[PDB]
Amino acid sequence: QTQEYTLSHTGGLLGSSKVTTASNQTAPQRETAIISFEVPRKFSEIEYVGQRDATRFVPRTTEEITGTANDDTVVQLQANIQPIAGEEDMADQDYPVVVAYNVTQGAQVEIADVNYATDEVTLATDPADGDTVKLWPIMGDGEVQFRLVNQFGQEEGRVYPWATPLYRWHDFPQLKRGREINLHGSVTWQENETVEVLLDAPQAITWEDADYPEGQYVSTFEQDVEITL
Amino acid sequence: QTQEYTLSHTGGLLGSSKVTTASNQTAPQRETAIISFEVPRKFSEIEYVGQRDATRFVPRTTEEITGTANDDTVVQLQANIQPIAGEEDMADQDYPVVVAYNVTQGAQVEIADVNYATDEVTLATDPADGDTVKLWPIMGDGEVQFRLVNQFGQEEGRVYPWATPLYRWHDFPQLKRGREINLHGSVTWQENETVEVLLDAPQAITWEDADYPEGQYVSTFEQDVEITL
Amino acid sequence: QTQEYTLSHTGGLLGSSKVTTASNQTAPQRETAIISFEVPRKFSEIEYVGQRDATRFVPRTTEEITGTANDDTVVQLQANIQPIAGEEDMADQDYPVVVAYNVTQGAQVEIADVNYATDEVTLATDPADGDTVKLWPIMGDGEVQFRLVNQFGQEEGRVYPWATPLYRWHDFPQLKRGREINLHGSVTWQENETVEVLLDAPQAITWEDADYPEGQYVSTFEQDVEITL
Amino acid sequence: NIGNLSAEKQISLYDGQPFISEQDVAAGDPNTPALTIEGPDGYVIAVDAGTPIAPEFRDSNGEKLDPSTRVIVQKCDRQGNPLGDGIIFNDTLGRFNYNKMRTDPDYMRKTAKSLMVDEREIVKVFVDVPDGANGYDAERSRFTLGDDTSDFGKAVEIVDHDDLTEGETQAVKS
Amino acid sequence: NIGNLSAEKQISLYDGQPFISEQDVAAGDPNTPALTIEGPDGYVIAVDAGTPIAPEFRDSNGEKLDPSTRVIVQKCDRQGNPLGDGIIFNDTLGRFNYNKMRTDPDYMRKTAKSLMVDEREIVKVFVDVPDGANGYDAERSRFTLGDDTSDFGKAVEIVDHDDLTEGETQAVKS
Amino acid sequence: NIGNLSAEKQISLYDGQPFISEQDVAAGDPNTPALTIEGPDGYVIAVDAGTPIAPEFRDSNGEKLDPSTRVIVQKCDRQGNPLGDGIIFNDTLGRFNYNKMRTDPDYMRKTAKSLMVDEREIVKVFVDVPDGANGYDAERSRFTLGDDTSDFGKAVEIVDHDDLTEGETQAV
């Protein structure tokens, strides 16, 4: 009676009550938690198996950039940027590495060119004095791990002690058999034995802003599982 | 004395007399015929075998678009567009999904960008008021089948009862071993036991216009066969 | 005590003294030598095995083109051009087939378009009257072979009597398992039993100019070997 | 002449068919099936452990819906009743890379397990749009289940019920 | 030192060779061979059941000719005489996808059967241009028969006639 | 609950770890290593006959250095001493096609042979820039040795020295 299933950063098999989202600590870097997975009312157990099971995670940050009469068109970011699957050609990245949106003009802000490893960007358009823009570059230079909870907060420990980096995460092209991710670890957790992902990085994270254009959800985490019903 | 050969939408082994081309019915969708294959004077028989034999079919439609003083550069189409083999990057589609041609200026009309699944297009150039342009997007959202004739019109029936779609046809990259098409069916037809392809779709089709730039033939069908001499 | 290693057009395991580079004869085509490989002080032997061992060779030529008040933007070349791995789209050639550099303006000269098999090129920029430009197209239409020396100049003979062409060399995409090169031949040479590559072609070759932008070395040859320490 | 054929036939399903059905959907209403497959009379169909899907589910404005969107294929007996014992393809939306995934072996998303469908049994395609997103339309959308033209992919296997003697057994299976 | 080698040698033929010959061709003249391979003296060659070809046959203006164009490789004895008993590679033109088919295992178009060529036997490449098309040129064109550098493809096998005792037998074969 | 695991653990090394080290490099200075891997104590790490590398080695301006550049991985015993009997991955730089080779099986490039690293043994990454080229930086560069996430590529095998009865044999 074992059937594979999929999870999400939102609702799904949990109703947005047996799951939470959360930002992270930045000023002191801390291996904080951003997302949990509580077993809901019904299930007997859940199973994760790295080296058999998949994973996806698309993280982005947020900032705020004004404009000027003699606007710059150019920005710098304190969050290292890389491509995802190959070149930095925004047309063919398999999803963009940057998103932008003007606030005054409730409209997108398209990109002209990127200063690649400089971590600076050139835009296509010309913002105005005192005009606000929101950006959503991807998140790199940060670790990730899994762990577990014994119904209170007493951790069993961790799935697999060694971490994994996010620039690497972006680097490996998702959506390709063999080139998929398959971590290491093998676990099981029954009712209220919640799981929590952890992240250690300087920079922030963003799940929602209510002004992000592309589908209400700035980032995501998605995952495969093998459930006993 | 069995030798493989190739057919065409034009002449070849038939002299453009034992073959015909034809458009389709649009206002009432009908599974009409567009092309036949009459056995010519000579042959003892012809054989088709899906799961062994190949096929190619490049269909395009036609329309007519005027221009304006404050010309639009933008068009919408009532014929769903997709890529062929991969991205919608007109440079590297393995053949374009759109062709355009101005009539006043007897010259091409190059494309800037495509609104992909919106089924709208942006152009590179600026047409003029009352200026005519002819387009030739590809044809999708339509079925296809084969059948047979007993020298009159009394159909034996059909090769393989289930149909096949054309968006799918475009999707599978032609020109790649294994990724080639090999339908299902196995038949034989002697002198005057003509074959007729059939198509059911809303939209039109186009074989020729005499103003299409690229080689006199807007569309094509091509096919492999195993002939007894 | 057998370990695989790599060679170069420069130094490396030879200190730029047990190796030389050289141009070729053009006015009379001669199967001349361009590069050698002397065993250095240390080794007991070296081994090459075609059908097991790899090879890389990126050859380019040189010319000199002035400019004009009513500059042309267009050039012709007496050296046939082809792509490397696929299309002639300079963005995605796996390395360009042409390089250009203005001398007055100590800057690159970008390309707009290529007349492909015509062996002519269109440029992006506008040179000036009496302005010098240096080009470095690739080299095709020429043979290649290997041979050997008995410490003087008395040749043992040749590795494999039949030649190999350079347009073909460019054609086969380097950097792909299976699609790699593996010639035919199997040899061994001890101290001072130098090897010499040979080339027969009309056109020149270029190893260095001291004004080539991309890394001091216009061309290269690189190779794998199996060494006894 | 025509070559004889077996009762088993290899096919690929899609939207513009008679027996299939569809409907538009609004955001935040996962229980609304956008596609309702429906067993034809005297025609059993079959799906092995792995077969492609082309879950093309775009907006009115011809845009794939939010990546947080999810798709759940699900078996149903009669009575319009969903069923947990028997379910295929729980997955997201903004993952497939439509343009190529209809083609390549690698993107190609296969099922979780096999399936059988008697002369009248339903299958539904539930679509969890999170909320506040763009609604769904079908005319600007498609869907498929098989790769029958090609040589590497799988296809749906149909049989006419009359051409068997195990039909009673499969009826007991249900 | 050099490693000894067998008489058998694995090669790949092409245009710019001495013993091969070529010529330009006009439309609607299929009987004109654009390539004339010609047995060298004291050198038998051999082709197994399947070996690649790169039928690069472009226009004066550097464009592959009409897809309705066809290519027929064909054996010939002496007397400049074609022959039906013995023929390879009857195929079209606008099919190969040049740019990759010189490379990939899949595009790679192999022969129909094997072949042998004594010290003077001819092979011809007839080119059926339908009519009214663009003429043929050779300098803007190429041709090949083998994949000897690689590891998956086949190659042409040459032998010197002196290094055999079955040469009389193969001469009787012809 | 958590599932038990073996002592052998599959990982993939890189720049931003503590026990690894690095430094910038100038042109024409092969003997200056840009990376110095160094055995932690109470650990052994192992590399089978073939394991990938991602030898990203870019300029200060974030550009891969000259294709004439060369990379040499090299084992080193203690004493900070290079070693010839025992060496991996002599290669150029201008051969990787970074953007794909981090991913693709064919562009992937493995080692020459296997390797083992006791509790205290060094490995060095020497870089032969020919001359007169652009200087090297490390912050604009990365490096790897394994593909543990994937399913076709290999990975580095770490063990804790305490968890073995063959520890004396692998010490010899």
Side-chain angles (χ1 to χ4, degrees):
Chain A
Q1 297 292 320
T2 61
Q3 294 81 17
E4 293 181 354
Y5 294 97
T6 302
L7 295 173
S8 67
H9 64 279
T10 185
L13 282 71
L14 299 174
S16 69
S17 179
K18 298 292 184 183
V19 65
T20 186
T21 61
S23 67
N24 56 0
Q25 290 178 1
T26 61
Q29 292 182 1
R30 181 66 180 83
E31 184 177 2
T32 63
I34 60 171
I35 188 166
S36 70
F37 293 99
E38 295 177 354
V39 175
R41 178 67 181 85
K42 300 185 281 186
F43 294 98
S44 66
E45 65 186 1
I46 296 169
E47 185 174 1
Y48 180 74
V49 176
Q51 297 297 112
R52 182 179 65 81
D53 191 85
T55 303
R56 184 176 178 181
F57 182 69
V58 176
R60 293 179 183 273
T61 62
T62 302
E63 70 175 6
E64 297 293 330
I65 302 297
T66 187
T68 303
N70 61 5
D71 57 354
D72 293 331
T73 305
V74 177
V75 297
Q76 185 175 359
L77 296 172
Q78 297 293 320
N80 192 358
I81 296 167
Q82 296 297 320
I84 299 161
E87 185 54 27
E88 191 275 323
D89 288 331
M90 295 299 292
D92 192 358
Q93 298 299 114
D94 296 331
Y95 63 90
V97 298
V98 175
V99 177
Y101 182 76
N102 186 356
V103 177
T104 301
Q105 295 178 355
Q108 296 297 110
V109 177
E110 293 80 2
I111 297 168
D113 191 358
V114 175
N115 292 319
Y116 180 75
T118 303
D119 298 332
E120 291 174 354
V121 176
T122 302
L123 294 174
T125 62
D126 290 330
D129 192 358
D131 191 358
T132 302
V133 178
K134 292 182 182 178
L135 282 75
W136 292 273
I138 61 168
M139 185 174 174
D141 293 331
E143 294 177 353
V144 65
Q145 293 181 357
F146 293 100
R147 67 176 173 89
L148 183 61
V149 177
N150 289 317
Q151 187 174 355
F152 295 97
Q154 289 94 30
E155 296 177 353
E156 282 287 327
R158 293 177 184 270
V159 178
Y160 183 75
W162 292 96
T164 301
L166 295 173
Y167 64 90
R168 181 181 298 277
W169 183 262
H170 295 288
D171 293 331
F172 289 107
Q174 296 295 322
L175 303 173
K176 182 64 74 168
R177 182 179 63 81
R179 293 183 185 83
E180 292 181 353
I181 302 296
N182 297 112
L183 295 173
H184 294 88
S186 65
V187 295
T188 301
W189 62 89
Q190 294 83 17
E191 185 176 3
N192 292 315
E193 293 179 353
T194 186
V195 176
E196 292 183 353
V197 176
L198 294 173
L199 188 151
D200 186 74
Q203 295 297 110
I205 189 163
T206 302
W207 293 99
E208 294 178 354
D209 287 331
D211 200 359
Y212 182 77
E214 293 180 354
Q216 185 173 357
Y217 292 94
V218 175
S219 296
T220 184
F221 180 75
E222 294 181 353
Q223 184 178 4
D224 187 358
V225 295
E226 184 177 2
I227 296 169
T228 301
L229 295 173
Chain B
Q1 297 292 320
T2 61
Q3 294 81 17
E4 293 181 354
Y5 294 97
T6 302
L7 295 173
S8 67
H9 64 279
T10 185
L13 282 71
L14 299 174
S16 69
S17 179
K18 298 292 184 183
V19 65
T20 186
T21 61
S23 67
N24 56 0
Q25 290 178 1
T26 61
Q29 292 182 1
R30 181 66 180 83
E31 184 177 2
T32 63
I34 60 171
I35 188 166
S36 70
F37 293 99
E38 295 177 354
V39 175
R41 178 67 181 85
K42 300 185 281 186
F43 294 98
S44 66
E45 65 186 1
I46 296 169
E47 185 174 1
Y48 180 74
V49 176
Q51 297 297 112
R52 182 179 65 81
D53 191 85
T55 303
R56 184 176 178 181
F57 182 69
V58 176
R60 293 179 183 273
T61 62
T62 302
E63 70 175 6
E64 297 293 330
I65 302 297
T66 187
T68 303
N70 61 5
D71 57 354
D72 293 331
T73 305
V74 177
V75 297
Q76 185 175 359
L77 297 172
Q78 297 293 320
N80 192 358
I81 296 167
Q82 296 297 320
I84 299 161
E87 185 54 27
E88 191 275 323
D89 288 331
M90 295 299 292
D92 192 358
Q93 298 299 114
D94 296 331
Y95 63 90
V97 298
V98 175
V99 177
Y101 182 76
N102 186 356
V103 177
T104 301
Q105 295 178 355
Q108 296 297 110
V109 177
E110 293 80 2
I111 297 168
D113 191 358
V114 175
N115 292 319
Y116 180 75
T118 303
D119 298 332
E120 291 174 353
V121 176
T122 302
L123 294 174
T125 62
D126 290 330
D129 192 358
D131 190 358
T132 302
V133 178
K134 292 182 182 178
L135 282 75
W136 292 273
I138 61 168
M139 185 175 174
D141 293 331
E143 294 177 353
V144 65
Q145 293 181 357
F146 293 100
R147 67 176 173 89
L148 183 61
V149 177
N150 289 317
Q151 187 174 355
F152 295 97
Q154 289 94 30
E155 296 177 353
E156 282 287 327
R158 293 177 184 270
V159 178
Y160 183 75
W162 292 96
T164 301
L166 295 173
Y167 64 90
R168 181 181 298 277
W169 183 262
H170 295 288
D171 293 331
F172 289 107
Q174 296 295 322
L175 303 173
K176 182 64 74 168
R177 182 179 63 81
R179 293 182 185 83
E180 292 181 354
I181 302 296
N182 297 112
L183 295 173
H184 294 88
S186 65
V187 295
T188 300
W189 62 89
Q190 294 83 17
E191 185 176 3
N192 292 315
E193 293 179 353
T194 186
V195 176
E196 292 183 353
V197 176
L198 294 173
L199 188 151
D200 186 74
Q203 295 297 110
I205 189 164
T206 302
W207 293 99
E208 294 178 354
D209 287 331
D211 200 359
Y212 182 77
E214 293 180 354
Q216 185 173 357
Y217 292 94
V218 175
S219 296
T220 184
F221 180 75
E222 294 181 353
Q223 184 178 4
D224 187 358
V225 295
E226 184 177 2
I227 296 170
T228 301
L229 295 173
Chain C
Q1 297 292 320
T2 61
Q3 294 81 17
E4 293 181 354
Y5 294 97
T6 302
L7 295 173
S8 67
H9 64 279
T10 185
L13 282 71
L14 299 174
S16 69
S17 179
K18 298 291 184 183
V19 65
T20 186
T21 61
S23 67
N24 56 0
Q25 290 178 1
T26 61
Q29 292 182 1
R30 181 66 180 83
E31 184 177 2
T32 63
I34 60 171
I35 188 166
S36 70
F37 293 99
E38 295 177 354
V39 175
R41 178 67 181 85
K42 300 185 281 186
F43 295 98
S44 66
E45 65 186 1
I46 296 169
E47 185 174 1
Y48 180 74
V49 176
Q51 297 297 112
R52 182 179 65 81
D53 191 85
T55 303
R56 184 176 178 181
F57 182 69
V58 176
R60 293 179 183 273
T61 62
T62 302
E63 70 175 6
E64 297 293 330
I65 302 297
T66 187
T68 303
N70 61 5
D71 57 354
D72 293 331
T73 305
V74 177
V75 297
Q76 185 175 359
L77 297 172
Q78 297 293 320
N80 192 358
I81 296 167
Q82 296 297 320
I84 299 161
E87 185 54 27
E88 191 275 323
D89 288 331
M90 295 299 292
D92 192 358
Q93 298 299 114
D94 296 331
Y95 63 90
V97 298
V98 175
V99 177
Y101 182 76
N102 186 356
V103 177
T104 301
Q105 295 178 355
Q108 296 297 110
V109 177
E110 293 80 2
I111 297 168
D113 191 358
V114 175
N115 292 319
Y116 180 75
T118 303
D119 298 332
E120 291 174 353
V121 176
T122 302
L123 294 173
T125 62
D126 290 330
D129 192 358
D131 191 358
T132 302
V133 178
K134 292 182 182 178
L135 282 75
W136 292 273
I138 61 168
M139 185 174 174
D141 293 331
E143 294 177 353
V144 65
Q145 293 181 356
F146 293 100
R147 67 176 173 89
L148 183 61
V149 177
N150 289 317
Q151 187 174 355
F152 295 97
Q154 289 94 30
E155 296 177 353
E156 282 287 327
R158 293 177 184 270
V159 178
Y160 183 75
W162 292 96
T164 301
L166 295 173
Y167 64 90
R168 181 181 298 277
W169 183 262
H170 295 288
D171 293 331
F172 289 107
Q174 296 295 322
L175 303 173
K176 182 64 74 168
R177 182 179 63 81
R179 293 183 185 83
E180 292 181 353
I181 302 296
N182 297 112
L183 295 173
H184 294 88
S186 65
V187 295
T188 301
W189 62 88
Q190 294 83 17
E191 185 176 3
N192 292 315
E193 293 179 353
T194 186
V195 176
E196 292 183 353
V197 176
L198 294 173
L199 188 151
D200 186 74
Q203 295 297 110
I205 189 163
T206 302
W207 293 99
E208 294 178 354
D209 287 331
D211 200 359
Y212 181 77
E214 293 180 354
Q216 185 173 357
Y217 292 94
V218 175
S219 296
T220 184
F221 180 75
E222 294 181 353
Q223 184 178 4
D224 187 358
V225 295
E226 184 177 2
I227 296 169
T228 301
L229 295 173
Chain D
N1 190 1
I2 296 167
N4 190 0
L5 295 174
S6 178
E8 294 80 359
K9 296 183 288 295
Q10 295 179 356
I11 62 171
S12 66
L13 295 173
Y14 63 90
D15 188 359
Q17 290 185 359
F19 63 92
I20 190 165
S21 296
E22 66 183 359
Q23 63 185 0
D24 294 331
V25 176
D29 191 358
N31 290 318
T32 303
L35 295 174
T36 302
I37 296 167
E38 185 175 1
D41 186 73
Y43 292 100
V44 65
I45 60 168
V47 177
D48 63 355
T51 60
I53 302 169
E56 288 181 344
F57 294 99
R58 292 182 179 88
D59 191 359
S60 181
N61 197 5
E63 294 179 353
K64 65 181 180 181
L65 295 173
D66 297 336
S68 302
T69 303
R70 294 180 67 188
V71 177
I72 297 169
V73 174
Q74 186 175 2
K75 185 176 180 181
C76 300
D77 58 354
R78 294 181 179 88
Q79 293 87 22
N81 187 356
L83 182 63
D85 184 74
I87 189 165
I88 302 297
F89 183 75
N90 189 1
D91 195 355
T92 188
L93 187 152
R95 182 178 288 175
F96 293 96
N97 195 1
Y98 295 102
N99 59 5
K100 291 178 183 296
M101 60 81 66
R102 291 179 292 175
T103 65
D104 192 80
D106 298 331
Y107 290 111
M108 183 179 177
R109 296 297 180 86
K110 293 181 181 180
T111 61
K113 64 181 183 180
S114 67
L115 182 62
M116 292 181 185
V117 177
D118 291 331
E119 296 178 352
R120 293 179 179 176
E121 293 181 353
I122 297 168
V123 176
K124 292 184 183 175
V125 176
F126 294 99
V127 176
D128 184 75
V129 176
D131 55 355
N134 296 116
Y136 181 76
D137 285 335
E139 68 279 17
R140 296 289 184 272
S141 176
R142 292 190 296 272
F143 181 78
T144 67
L145 184 61
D147 183 358
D148 58 357
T149 63
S150 180
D151 293 330
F152 64 88
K154 299 290 180 69
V156 176
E157 185 173 2
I158 186 163
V159 176
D160 188 355
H161 187 274
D162 61 357
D163 294 331
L164 295 174
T165 62
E166 294 177 354
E168 68 279 18
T169 62
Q170 294 179 355
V172 174
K173 299 293 182 181
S174 69
Chain E
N1 190 1
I2 296 167
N4 190 0
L5 295 173
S6 178
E8 293 80 359
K9 296 183 288 295
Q10 294 179 356
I11 62 171
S12 66
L13 295 173
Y14 63 90
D15 188 359
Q17 290 185 359
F19 63 92
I20 190 165
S21 296
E22 66 183 359
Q23 63 185 0
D24 294 331
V25 176
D29 191 358
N31 290 318
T32 303
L35 295 174
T36 302
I37 296 167
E38 185 175 1
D41 186 73
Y43 292 100
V44 65
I45 60 168
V47 177
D48 63 356
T51 60
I53 302 169
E56 288 181 344
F57 294 99
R58 292 182 179 88
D59 191 359
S60 181
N61 197 5
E63 294 179 353
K64 65 181 180 181
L65 295 173
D66 297 336
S68 302
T69 303
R70 294 180 67 188
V71 177
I72 297 169
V73 174
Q74 187 175 2
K75 185 176 180 181
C76 300
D77 58 354
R78 294 181 179 88
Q79 293 87 22
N81 187 356
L83 182 63
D85 184 74
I87 189 165
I88 302 297
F89 183 75
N90 189 1
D91 195 355
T92 188
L93 187 152
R95 182 178 288 175
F96 293 96
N97 195 1
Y98 294 102
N99 60 5
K100 291 178 183 296
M101 60 81 66
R102 291 179 292 175
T103 65
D104 192 80
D106 298 331
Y107 290 111
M108 183 179 176
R109 296 297 180 86
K110 293 181 181 180
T111 61
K113 64 181 183 180
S114 67
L115 182 62
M116 292 181 185
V117 177
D118 291 331
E119 296 178 352
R120 293 179 179 176
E121 293 181 353
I122 297 168
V123 176
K124 292 184 183 175
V125 176
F126 294 99
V127 177
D128 184 75
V129 177
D131 55 354
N134 296 116
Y136 181 76
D137 285 335
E139 68 279 17
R140 296 289 184 272
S141 176
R142 292 190 296 272
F143 181 78
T144 67
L145 184 61
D147 183 358
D148 58 357
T149 63
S150 180
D151 293 331
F152 64 88
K154 299 290 180 69
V156 176
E157 185 173 2
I158 186 163
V159 176
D160 188 355
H161 187 274
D162 61 357
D163 294 331
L164 295 174
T165 62
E166 294 177 354
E168 68 279 18
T169 62
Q170 294 179 356
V172 174
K173 298 293 182 181
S174 69
Chain F
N1 190 0
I2 296 168
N4 191 0
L5 295 173
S6 178
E8 293 81 359
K9 296 183 289 295
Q10 294 179 357
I11 60 170
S12 67
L13 296 172
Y14 63 91
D15 188 358
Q17 292 181 358
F19 64 93
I20 190 164
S21 297
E22 66 182 359
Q23 63 185 359
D24 293 333
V25 175
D29 190 359
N31 290 318
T32 301
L35 295 174
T36 301
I37 296 168
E38 185 176 2
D41 187 74
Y43 292 100
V44 63
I45 60 168
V47 177
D48 63 356
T51 60
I53 302 169
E56 291 183 355
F57 293 100
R58 292 182 179 87
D59 192 0
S60 181
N61 197 4
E63 295 178 354
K64 66 181 181 181
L65 295 173
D66 294 333
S68 301
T69 303
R70 294 180 69 185
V71 177
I72 297 169
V73 173
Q74 187 174 0
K75 184 178 182 179
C76 301
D77 58 353
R78 293 182 179 88
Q79 293 87 24
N81 188 358
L83 182 62
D85 183 72
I87 188 165
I88 302 297
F89 183 76
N90 190 0
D91 191 356
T92 187
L93 188 152
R95 186 179 290 173
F96 294 95
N97 193 5
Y98 294 102
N99 59 5
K100 292 182 184 294
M101 60 82 67
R102 292 179 294 174
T103 66
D104 185 76
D106 295 330
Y107 292 104
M108 183 179 177
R109 298 296 180 84
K110 293 183 182 177
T111 61
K113 65 182 182 180
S114 67
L115 181 63
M116 292 181 185
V117 176
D118 292 330
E119 294 179 353
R120 295 183 179 174
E121 293 183 354
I122 297 168
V123 176
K124 292 184 183 175
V125 176
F126 294 101
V127 177
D128 187 74
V129 176
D131 55 353
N134 296 116
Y136 181 76
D137 287 336
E139 68 279 18
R140 296 289 184 271
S141 177
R142 293 189 295 274
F143 181 78
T144 66
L145 184 62
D147 189 359
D148 59 353
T149 63
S150 178
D151 292 330
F152 64 89
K154 298 290 180 69
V156 176
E157 184 177 1
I158 187 162
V159 176
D160 188 355
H161 187 274
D162 61 355
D163 294 332
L164 295 174
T165 61
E166 293 179 353
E168 68 278 15
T169 61
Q170 294 179 356
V172 175

